[PDB]
């Protein structure tokens, strides 16, 4: 699906650049997009998800909230409710052109919609119960069971991985076309602790 023509035309959709100091903590995902003007064709994009709501930094197309389960969290930017609880702080969902070696994150603001689908929600499961400090330099994507802790795959896995490696980071989901693969939330939680994957010399 990965069309670098419409990746293009849509980078002038990309306005208001800006370089932040770093979140208390935060969580990368991936946005897959395609225009109904364009039928086969996609390109992905990333999210860094940071503490505190700001309606306000997004463009007005983003700017919806959606909401943890039992009235327990939010999250701008993201176009459907989460059928999990957080832990009751709001979050948005920003635009990622870089995270910078000291943690910095150099954000933007795209005239799009905001990010559907369920594929954010195996970060936002990770932000909420496993990450306290610090952006893992990961990107993950993957779907979350009702028994929320197993990942269960989602569309555009290699939309989403081209994205994570322009911007110098491997893709971590369940299924094949990621980097790192993770069956479930405390594999995934297991990995950020590492560091990357554990290494087994012989
Ligand atoms: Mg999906």
Redesign the pocket.
Known sequence: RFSRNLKDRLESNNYEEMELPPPTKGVIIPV?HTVESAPGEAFGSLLVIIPGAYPELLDPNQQVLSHFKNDTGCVWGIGEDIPFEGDDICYTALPLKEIKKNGNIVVEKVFAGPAM???CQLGLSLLVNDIDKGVPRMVFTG?IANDEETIVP???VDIAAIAAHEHGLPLVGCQPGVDEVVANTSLASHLIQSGALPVQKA
């Open positions: 897959v689908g369920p594929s779907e989602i569309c555009g």
